[PDB]
Nucleic acid binder design. Structure first.
Lengths: 192, 187
DNA sequence: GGAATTATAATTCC
DNA sequence: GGAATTATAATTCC
């Protein structure tokens, strides 16, 4: 149980780090038979992070503008994964800082699709996008999301419930032989 | 106006022929705007015929077990097509012959899928089948019909009142039964 | 999980 | 209306 529910190959960070919680999502079930998870966005003086939390006992600590310290958390390609191995404490005023405004704006900022298509395959994509279609198949749901200059197709095979201006969390970029698409993954989540 | 609504290349038979109505279908809409049609099965002593009727005035004459005489009807590849040009009269008792048991048996008989697949492409298929698969798509609906023991896939790209087959078209890489102009489905 | 394979639906040309 | 083309979904293999 040390690296349980953590994406494989993730690095372990023993050293404590103090962050400010920007956003958090409601817990949801990402797979049959396993505990729920939620997505979060946090920030330090130097950068903003995207976070997956698998210990539901930590949900209360993840509230807007709350300062917390995390130890023994995991890092999977610039993304922080937290399970029961991690220690999370409400921060003391001594390590409390001010988060630069530009970082927060950036955290709210959504990447553009044109640049998205240029990323390495398997990169995790987060953002708010505009929707042009909803196509329903037995085993998948397909969206087309747009910006001012481009569009990409989104595939969701996970469940058809709760699917009906769209915020996406942890979708997988695929530059196939074909054109690029965004595909659902282990931790893929959709908000309105 | 003659040969109206008739499948093209159909031969014309001016000579009157007297037949017995075995089965008739309820009139239905096979094409947008066009008048309704119904399917029928009739028989003479030598063979059974499948009939497509495009004149709705003729619906009563096509009642079960009724003897009627038809002249100037059309024959499109072994299929009888009737429009308003054709003359249909109630038959007189002297031609009201008896249809042999074997012919009616053939008329009721549904061909088996294994031999169906061997028929020429474009052949029209009629029969009663059992379904074990039903798939709904935006632009079509697909089911599977089977016998003991063989199977074929049926494609329907028309209006989707769907929950016995008439005039389906047999089709390349793998055989299918496809909907056409006069395709009708009964329960 | 992603790409490549196969299955399948819809479009198009004759 | 049928077959071949292309588009699309699902399956499979690494």
């Amino acid at each position: 149980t040390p690296k349980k529910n953590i994406s494989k190959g993730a690095v372990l960070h023993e050293k404590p780090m103090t962050v400010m919680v920007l956003t958090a999502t409601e817990p949801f079930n990402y797979k049959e038979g396993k505990e729920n998870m939620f997505h979060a966005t946090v920030a330090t003086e130097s950068q903003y992070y995207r976070v997956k939390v698998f210990n539901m006992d930590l949900k209360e600590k993840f509230t807007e503008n709350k300062f917390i310290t995390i130890s023994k958390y995991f890092n999977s390609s610039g993304i922080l994964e937290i399970n029961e191995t991690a220690t999370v404490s409400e921060a003391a005023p001594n390590q409390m800082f001010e988060v630069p405004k530009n970082i927060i704006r950036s955290a709210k900022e959504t990447l553009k699709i044109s640049k998205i298509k240029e990323l390495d395959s398997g990169t995790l994509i987060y953002g708010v996008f505009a929707v042009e279609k909803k196509k329903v198949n037995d085993k998948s749901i397909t969206f087309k999301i747009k910006d001012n200059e481009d569009n990409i197709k989104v595939v969701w095979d996970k469940e058809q419930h709760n699917i009906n201006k769209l915020q996406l969390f942890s979708f997988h970029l695929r530059k196939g032989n074909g054109k690029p698409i965004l595909h659902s993954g282990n931790h893929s989540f959709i908000k309105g």
